[PDB]
């Protein structure tokens, strides 16, 4: 029996449902996982630290969960000191942090390749400051290297109570340079609000262009900008044409809404799919430990999280070295890792919006 810890934000209903589906689906014979679910906040680092020390008091071998941009350094510090691996579907970090395994591939390089394929020089970039500032620095460095005209504007500093005149003033100021082209980099809720306000002010006719910079391009509502005329591009990680993905959707849409909240959909969010893939990755790694006959068994006496000096236990160092030795096939396609913890040998589809719906035009990898 392997005891692990699980942290989930207050509001993550579909992700915990896909986690339950992955735990039922990937049950093995040699052992059994036991997640300790902590449904606390994600922005308040005090509650995150409390849940971290509560999971560390149980003596767990791995910790799964999300993190906010205001708590990324807290997670990397607390997981690098105590040498405990942390598997996450959240946004990638800026650096090679030990014991941090990530499920989201790079979005910056795919976006730069998409701009270099579309042969652009002047556009606007409406971003959000909740997943770091990595892509912003990347596109500003590429604009300095390629002599572009990027109008980079944050949108995350606007409240939900007066977001009608601020967006009107923003898209009125974007008409000063006559910007025919805007790249949107927002979360799954802000994209829908910006698209609804654009439809309200009427800026989705043929003559403009949009790019939804996320992995879940089909997660938003695209029936409202389907008949507009402005061709909209985006990136997709969950290819629905695969047999395993189609079987997972056929087993997903037939589920009960009351038994699994947010599961009676024809699609699925990308974070839920990365959670379902991370369950498979952890199951394959623990099965490789059960097959290599490595005894790391202990009890729930790991001590307090604030020990001075907090002494590590060396058998966890192999566990991250086990996690880098995992190359499987899941809803994100191929899963292969480096020595740091990033994802290698991945494939992201580039979706363009047609009249009949979303249509794929090609794929992108890091080796090509």
């Amino acid at each position, epitope marked *: *029996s392997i005891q692990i810890g699980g942290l989930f934000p207050r509001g993550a209903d579909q992700e915990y449902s896909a986690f339950r589906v992955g735990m039922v689906q990937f049950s093995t014979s040699e052992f059994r996982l*036991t997640p300790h679910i902590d449904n606390l906040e994600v922005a308040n680092s005090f509650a995150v630290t409390n849940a971290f020390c509560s999971q560390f008091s149980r003596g767990v071998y791995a910790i799964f969960g999300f993190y906010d941009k205001k708590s990324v350094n807290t997670i990397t510090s607390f997981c690098g000191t105590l040498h405990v691996s942390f598997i996450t579907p959240s946004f990638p970090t800026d650096g090679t942090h030990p014991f941090v395994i990530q499920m989201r591939p790079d979005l910056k390089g795919a976006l730069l390749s998409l701009i270099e394929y579309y042969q652009w020089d002047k556009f606007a970039y409406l971003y959000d400051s909740d997943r770091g500032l990595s892509t912003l620095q990347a596109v500003l460095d590429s604009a300095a290297e390629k002599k572009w005209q990027v109008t980079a504007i944050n949108v995350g500093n606007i409240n939900n109570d007066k977001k009608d005149e601020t967006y009107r003033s923003l898209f009125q100021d974007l008409e000063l340079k006559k910007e025919r082209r805007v790249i949107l980099d927002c979360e799954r809720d802000k994209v829908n609000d910006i698209v609804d306000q654009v439809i309200t002010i009427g800026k989705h006719v043929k003559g403009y262009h949009y790019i939804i910079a996320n992995l879940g391009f089909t997660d938003g509502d695209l029936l409202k900008i389907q008949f507009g005329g402005a061709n909209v591009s985006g990136f997709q990680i969950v290819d629905y044409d695969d047999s395993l993905v189609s079987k997972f959707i056929e*087993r997903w849409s037939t589920l009960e809404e009351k038994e699994y909240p947010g599961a009676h959909t024809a699609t699925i969010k990308y974070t839920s799919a990365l959670t379902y893939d991370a369950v498979q990755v952890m199951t394959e790694a623990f099965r490789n430990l059960r097959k290599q006959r490595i005894e790391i068994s202990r009890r*729930g006496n790991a001590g307090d999280c604030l020990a001075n000096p907090a002494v590590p236990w060396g058998q966890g160092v192999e566990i991250e070295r086990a996690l880098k030795q995992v190359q499987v096939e899941g809803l994100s396609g191929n899963i292969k890792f480096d020595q740091n913890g990033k994802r290698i040998n991945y494939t992201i589809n580039i979706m363009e919006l047609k009249t009949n719906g979303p249509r794929k035009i090609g794929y992108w990898s890091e080796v090509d």
Partner: antibody
Amino acid sequence: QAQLKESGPGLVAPSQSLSITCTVSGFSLTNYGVHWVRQPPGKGLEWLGVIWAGGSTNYNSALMSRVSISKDNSKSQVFLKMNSLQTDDTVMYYCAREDYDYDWHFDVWGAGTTVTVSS
Amino acid sequence: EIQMTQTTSSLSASLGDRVTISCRASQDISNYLSWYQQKPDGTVKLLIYYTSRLHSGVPSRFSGSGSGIDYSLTINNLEQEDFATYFCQQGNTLPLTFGAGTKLELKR
């Protein structure tokens, strides 16, 4: 509502086979797992084995070479096969459904059938 | 393996009593235990999951508490449909050994 019903032959000879049929209704057997357990009269209930929704199956360590499980999702039936029966097999058999609700829990169980092994 | 035990074998209560049923284990299970009810015909259903929450379909009259190795189920008011066998099930390590089980009884 979900209901499970266990049935068997009841009277079986020693050192023979035993096929128990568990019929479940009110839910689907493609996304949940099944668990078969025994119950001795006057003693503690012991878990015989379990099968998952994805085809994975496990059993107890003492009689892993004596129990097998098959399933039919069209009839929502679970067939448990038990061989090498002895005189101490006059017990009850129950079948339950498993779920993840922050712990591996048994939600919907059955009535259980009485099997008496005698010659 | 992990041996589960229950001292109370037959409990006596009336209609409307807050009855408690305790359970102990061989070690700490970190509240990964469930409480289930089984009628006299043999049909068993779940009552309380993860030792503190209630499942969808059970009433709000039952609850649970406890920590470490000592858990407990609690009923605020006993009903006619509440006359059943209560069993505790641990889910820490394989094989999942269930509890001994207690049987409620009406006082007259």
